[PDB]
A paper describes a structure:
CPS secretion is mediated by an ABC transporter containing KpsT and KpsM as its nucleotide-binding domain (NBD) and transmembrane domain, respectively. The transporter partners with the periplasmic and inner-membrane-anchored KpsE subunit, a class-3 polysaccharide co-polymerase (PCP), as well as with KpsD, which is assumed to form an outer-membrane pore. The KpsMT transporter is surrounded by a cage of eight KpsE subunits extending about 80 Å into the periplasm. Cryo-electron microscopy analyses of the KpsMT–KpsE complex in six different states reveal a KpsE-encaged ABC transporter, rigid-body conformational rearrangements of KpsMT during ATP hydrolysis and recognition of a glycolipid inside a membrane-exposed electropositive canyon.
To determine how KpsMT recognizes the glycolipid, the purified KpsMT–KpsE complex was preincubated with the isolated glycolipid before cryo grid preparation. Cryo-EM analyses of this sample provided additional cryo-EM maps similar in overall architecture to the Apo 1 state, but with poorly defined KpsT subunits. KpsT was therefore placed after focused refinement and rigid-body docking. However, in contrast to all other structures, we identified two states of a lipid molecule bound inside the canyon (referred to as state-1 and state-2). In state-2, the lipid is shifted by about 7 Å towards the periplasm, such that the carboxyl group of the putative Kdo sugar is in proximity to Arg35 and Arg94 of the interface helix and TM2, respectively. The lipid phosphate group contacts Arg187 of TM5 in the opposing KpsM subunit. Furthermore, at the C-terminal end of this helix, Gln181 is suitably positioned to interact with the Kdo moiety. Relative to the estimated cytosolic and periplasmic membrane boundaries, the glycolipid sits about halfway across the membrane, in agreement with it representing a translocation substrate. Compared with state-1, the second lipid-binding pose further correlates with an approximately 6 Å rigid-body translation of the KpsM subunits against each other, thereby widening the space between the KpsM protomers and narrowing the entry to the polysaccharide canyon by around 3 Å. Extending this KpsM movement could create a channel-forming transporter conformation, as observed for the O-antigen WzmWzt transporter.
Author numbering:
A (entry chain B), B (entry chain A): 1 to 226
C (entry chain J): 3 to 46
D (entry chain D), E (entry chain C): 14 to 269
F (entry chain K), G (entry chain J): 340 to 370
H (entry chain L): 340 to 371
I (entry chain I): 340 to 368
Amino acid sequence: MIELRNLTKWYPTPHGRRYVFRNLNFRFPDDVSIGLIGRNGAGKSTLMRLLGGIEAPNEGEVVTDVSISWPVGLSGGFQGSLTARENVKFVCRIYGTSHEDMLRKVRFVEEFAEIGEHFDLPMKTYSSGMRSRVAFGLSMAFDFDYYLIDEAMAVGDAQFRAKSRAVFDSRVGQANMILVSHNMNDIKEYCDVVVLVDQGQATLYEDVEAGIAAYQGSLKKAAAKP
Amino acid sequence: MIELRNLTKWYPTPHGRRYVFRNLNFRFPDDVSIGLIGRNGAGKSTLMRLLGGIEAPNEGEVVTDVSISWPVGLSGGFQGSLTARENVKFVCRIYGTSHEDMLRKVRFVEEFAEIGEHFDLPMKTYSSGMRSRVAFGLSMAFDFDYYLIDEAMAVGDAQFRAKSRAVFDSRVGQANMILVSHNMNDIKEYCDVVVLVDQGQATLYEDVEAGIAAYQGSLKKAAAKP
Amino acid sequence: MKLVSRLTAKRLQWALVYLPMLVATVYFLVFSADRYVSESVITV
Amino acid sequence: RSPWQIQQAVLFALFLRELKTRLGGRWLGVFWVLLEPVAHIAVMTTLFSLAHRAAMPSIEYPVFLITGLIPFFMFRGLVTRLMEAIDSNRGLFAYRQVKPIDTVIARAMLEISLQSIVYLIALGTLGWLGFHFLPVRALELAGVSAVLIMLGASLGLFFAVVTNEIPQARAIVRISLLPLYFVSGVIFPVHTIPPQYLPLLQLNPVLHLIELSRASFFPQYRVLQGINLAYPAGFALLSLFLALMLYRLRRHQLAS
Amino acid sequence: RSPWQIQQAVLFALFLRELKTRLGGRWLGVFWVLLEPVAHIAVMTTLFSLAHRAAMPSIEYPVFLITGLIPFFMFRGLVTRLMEAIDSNRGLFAYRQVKPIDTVIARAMLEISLQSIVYLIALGTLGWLGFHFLPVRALELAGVSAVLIMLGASLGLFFAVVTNEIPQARAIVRISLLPLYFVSGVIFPVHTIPPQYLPLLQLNPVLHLIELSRASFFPQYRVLQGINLAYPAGFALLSLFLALMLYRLRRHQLAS
Amino acid sequence: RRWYNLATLLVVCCLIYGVVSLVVATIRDHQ
Amino acid sequence: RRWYNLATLLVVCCLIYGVVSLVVATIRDHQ
Amino acid sequence: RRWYNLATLLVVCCLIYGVVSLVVATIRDHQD
Amino acid sequence: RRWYNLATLLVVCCLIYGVVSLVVATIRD
Ligand SMILES: CCCCCCCCCCCC(=O)O[C@@H](COC(=O)CCCCCCCCCC)COP(=O)(O)OC[C@H](O)CO[C@@]1(C(=O)O)C[C@H](O)[C@@H](O)[C@H]([C@@H](O)CO)O1
């Protein structure tokens, strides 16, 4: 179960406290695929950071009895100076796995990276898509109950997407994937329920198309406001 | 006229000197739109930085009798603690314009910024989009013979792209823009000549489609190598 | 290599704590000998 | 899992990380750490050996300087390294297990281990050269050193919590640390200090701890009037309480 | 446009840049550079007022301390900040007409301006408090100060060029500025120490420059043997030549 | 002087109990 | 001093045990 | 010198008030 | 003092081995 109790997150601004969320109490549905959608600036990034633990909420708490992964494709969870293998070492020792499984996961991230000698080179010299490949390898190497993805489709080349959806379908069914994507067809295909974030409030829809209609109506109301 | 005489640029690596370019002599064609294409890691970013003067070549020189602008969308040309207006002041103060042109350029940057009161705030609290918009405003607040773009198309929302291309179409004809993009259709539309970078060597193609065919053949040869 | 692999917590605890304490225990309480001290204070 | 086992996991992880960053990777920093005390001895002993022999003829100068310096170096490290603990590990502060208290605890453990190793090495070297290197009273010296540990770690945590913002203020920490090397009885005995400067000199807890450690080290060492353990012990206890309370207030505000 | 005009414009631009990044906008830097000296004369006085009045009962201690302190502050600031200029402004350059030497000499000229302002303020308040505040030979003082400024700027540029890609060595330079304050005749008259220590201390050019600056300030001031200006002049000339030649070698480098 | 040590030791146990409670709270923060 | 020496020996033994344990854990993880 | 003792009483009462306020805030944070 | 000289010679030789190995490791890269 995933729950947000009295959640309140804001950013410091010179004009005051810009509240992104305030007293947000909401329970995520169980064993279903979740599509988190919303307007730009409505707090989708803030909420996926709070779900993944990237940001600490000012008030309230997140109650979760299962394992939630970090967002896939984000490069802000690593350090530039060390080489890629050293970052895999770092994340493995934070999670604290056995040495044999440590070596196996290094082998797996080497396999899914397809990187070469730059695997022994520091991350500060990497490019955007290659850092995204490193992040994908670190995210996939593990086994997680819930996977957070902030629209990682539009990274890398076509072959990267091919292997991505291949191992995705390999992992389909053993975990529930939360997707924050502006591609609404992806929300149709890869999700079971729709949670929309608007004005700091999250609304749940068991039917995907109901959330589609609600989001489209909200966009039309925003556009029609004079 | 842009010419590269005996250019040799490399990066320090623990394994030795990784030569990116070595004795690169090449003359860019005049009064034409240039499309810089090449493989990943072939040196497009490094050569583009050398053209913009971002990095200093170890040997050789860059001979240019016209004005070449910095890459559009790059956020590494400013200072974090200064505000946006202070960064405008800094840039123009190297460039050294008159006070009327000072105030007009500040107003133009504020106009193309569409950021608001955060325009009076330091950029250390900015997001990537805000810094990219500031860079675009600075790259446009001036008048140059040649403009450098490191695939700045896929930054920002749709209205940002529409406004950027509107001012672009205002500025076509009076300058030659060099674009480094993986979108080959953009290379077709916005360029007249093609410069292909491979193995530290630049090959010139007066026909765009000839350079496209050469790049496709190079990619096929790289993929077919066992 | 394998030499540092056999240095488990129990083996290191034995080789560094319990044996020194044990040898000190068997020496000081029974094997030791009393040494009386007499003190004087002089000057010239 | 229990909080205790995940605590050992996370502290071991940050301990090996901190060993990596402080030692430079190739284990080059050990030479620096070993070379500062001996360089201090070489500078210190060449001007005041005769003065000390006139002052306290019964005590050898190098052992006096070891006992005066290495605890002070340990305290200075415990303050400085732990004050700047948050900024160094800032980029990896969002893993739900990497709270700042673990970072400061890991830095403290690393510094204690390193300086204890240096203490043992220096004592062995002193014994190897024919000096006097066995403390007559061992566990009282250990207790005084533990009081010094508690005071130093408490002050470091307090300064790290208080100065999370305004890092410029960190300057008036380390700049203020340099006079503490001179005013406390580290390099020259406070026996020669005129009594009219003595009262304010008693306000330094580090002076009390250094003097008590030296008294517990050497045989027949005299302590000055007004030196006691109660004042530095109370200072350490109060500072630890204040630092823990201040960290508990601003626990959630040290994440970015 | 002539290269001289380009140099003028670029040095003015990064002078404003440096002025901002040094005083921080809030102008707290002027507060610190006005309060650090008066702190030094405060503590230094309350230490050795009686000692100085017994050593040379002809010159008041505060004016001696000012004349020995402010040039040393200028020299230290020159060395440190002209060393750190390239590391600070690595984000700069890359836009043509900007070279490392521009940032180096901009930091230099800011340092001389600030320290000359502080010197004038100090002389003004010294005259305001009923102390001797007018040099008897101002031209010699100007020449000695120019020699010291040239030596400091040249050494700073030399260390900025040499210790590129090795930042840790910079720290060593910082710590070697600590003995100089205690050895270059700044806080106490140098005639007190025995002459057997004297010849080694003659290898320090800063002691020669400070003593010659003092000799050009007070009337009937005593200068001891071997304090000629030829040695500091040659030191400054050689250091400037080496620094300029090394910068010319690593000119196309140093730009990221 | 009985009341002096009574008050001093009361302050000491209050401080020690507070320190231990804060330490165990920080330990139990991890879940 | 029998119990005295036992106490000091136990303290130093615990200290060297802790330092050596940290060292062996470090070298085991490094390999 | 009544004003002098009042002046010291100002700062000692302010210190006591600050310390007890911090303790109360700690207890309140513990009661969340 | 044959054992004493042997032990201190071991110490200095090991120290010089360590410093030359550190120098070699720094200059190999
Ligand atoms: C709790 C306050 C107590 C104040 C004590 C003052 C005494 C003198 C201290 C020396 C003051 C000092 O700094 O040391 C000097 C040399 O010291 C000595 O030889 C001491 C000789 C005798 C003293 C010992 C005898 C003790 C006898 C009984 C007490 C060079 O050290 P250093 O190379 O590290 O200097 C670096 C700067 O300090 C950097 O600081 C900055 C700045 O200037 O750029 C940085 C930044 O700008 C900002 O953070 C910061 C500012 O803005 C924020 O206030 O100033």
